[PDB]
Write a protein that binds this ligand. Structure first.
Ligand SMILES: CCCN(CCC)C(=O)c1cccc(C(=O)N[C@@H](Cc2ccccc2)[C@@H](N)C[C@@H](C)C(=O)Nc2ccc(F)cc2)c1
Length: 373
């Protein structure tokens, strides 16, 4: 049942959302980070200063060695591991056990976060970008193949310790208000979408829409910030900087290096603009926009003063729709129908005068005009 899967995600702000999983026989409990931005299921398999527990292949009778080395470089951080198969379960997910590929992390650089409470990564994206090759079946692919669990999952990430829901095998209707708006998955590698228009405070950025997706645009639960290509970032910052001319900022603030503070509860939310990302619909006249408040891109950081970090950074590998974007919304990864749905989450940040929204329809440009090749 879907009720059993509600509130099954936990985490710490800016340290990722994780799900409880068991590996091996007898089952070993491990918290695993939910990452829609990669395709490898990997778990710490050796002692680490940041790990409280790890996967022990010697203690599992159902463990099978694949005798193959694997290495995955992320945008930030990387790990090395030995490949193998074992029985995997999700206690607060569907009541099933599956044989899946597991990368036993032996060494890593800047991957694990100190006190994050997670011990591994669940790559929910497609085989095309799995390491070392697309022949290594990702976990969700293994789950669908072995069971009757529908080829669909949905993420409801809630902001300010953080909680959330990963509904495996369908959609939970109590976790969203209004309508679900779907955007096509352009290619089955990352969860690649197409951004067709960007509006800041109702003003069009007036950029070639191919720039918004320069290289690509991806939906990534394993990235905190909203990330934009160099050119788009430059224009976006120029808009937010000009909208908030009343307050003075340090130079490092816009680069995610410095924090800005105000008096307790005297945060000037009003002068910070809303950002509208328009996502191409399955039909071009059925496109829609997701609007995010300053409360989403100005992340709270730990003095009675309220301090905030600018949670928009530039990218070299295209747009990344991180937690910042996802946190206000119920995001449905409809793999079966090659599309991603957006709806207003039940756990949204409540602004007095403004509201985060998924609104449509809109007429926009299509894949020919906005897609990069
Ligand atoms: C959420 C925790 C807080 N952090 C980490 C702490 C600063 C962030 O918000 C953060 C900030 C910047 C970058 C990344 C980042 O690289 N995240 C990784 C996931 C991950 C999660 C936790 C620890 C480190 C990495 C992906 N989600 C990124 C994708 C694009 C990618 O590399 N795919 C990819 C790469 C190779 C491949 F063969 C196929 C696919 C994450």
């Amino acid at each position: 049942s879907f009720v059993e899967m509600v509130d099954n995600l936990r985490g710490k702000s800016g340290q990722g959302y994780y799900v409880e999983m068991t590996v091996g026989s007898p089952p070993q409990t491990l918290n695993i980070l939910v990452d829609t931005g990669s395709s490898n299921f990997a778990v710490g398999a050796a002692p680490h200063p940041f790990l409280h527990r790890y996967y022990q292949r010697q203690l599992s009778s159902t463990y099978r060695d694949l005798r193959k080395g694997v290495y995955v470089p992320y945008t930030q951080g990387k790990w090395e591991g030995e490949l193998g198969t074992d029985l995997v379960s999700i206690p607060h997910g569907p009541n099933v056990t599956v044989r899946a590929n597991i990368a036993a992390i032996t060494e890593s650089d800047k991957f694990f976060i100190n006190g994050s409470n997670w011990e591994g990564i669940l790559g929910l994206a497609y085989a095309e970008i799995a390491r070392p090759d697309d022949s290594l079946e990702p976990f969700f692919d293994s789950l669908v193949k072995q069971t009757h669990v529908p080829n669909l999952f949905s993420l409801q990430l809630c902001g300010a310790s953080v909680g959330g829901s990963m509904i495996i095998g369908g959609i939970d209707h109590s976790l969203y208000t209004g309508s679900l708006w779907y955007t096509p998955i352009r290619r089955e590698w990352y969860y690649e979408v197409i951004i067709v228009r960007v509006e800041i405070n109702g003003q069009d950025l007036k950029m070639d829409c191919k720039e918004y997706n320069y290289d690509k645009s991806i939906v990534d639960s394993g990235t905190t910030n909203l990330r934009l290509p160099k050119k788009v970032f430059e224009a976006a910052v120029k808009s937010i900087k000009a909208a908030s001319s009343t307050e003075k900022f340090p130079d490092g603030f816009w680069l995610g290096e410095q924090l800005v503070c105000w008096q307790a509860g005297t945060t000037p939310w009003n002068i910070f603009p809303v950002i509208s990302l328009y996502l191409m619909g399955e039909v071009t006249n059925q496109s829609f926009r997701i609007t995010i408040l300053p409360q989403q891109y100005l992340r709270p950081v730990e003095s009675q003063d309220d301090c905030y970090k600018f949670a928009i950074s530039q990218s070299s590998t295209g747009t990344v729709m991180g937690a910042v974007i996802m946190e206000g919304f119920y995001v449905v990864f409809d793999r079966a129908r090659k599309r991603i749905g957006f709806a207003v989450s039940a756990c949204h940040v409540h602004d007095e005068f403004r509201t985060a929204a998924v609104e449509g329809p809109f007429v926009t440009l299509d894949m020919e005009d906005c897609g990069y090749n």
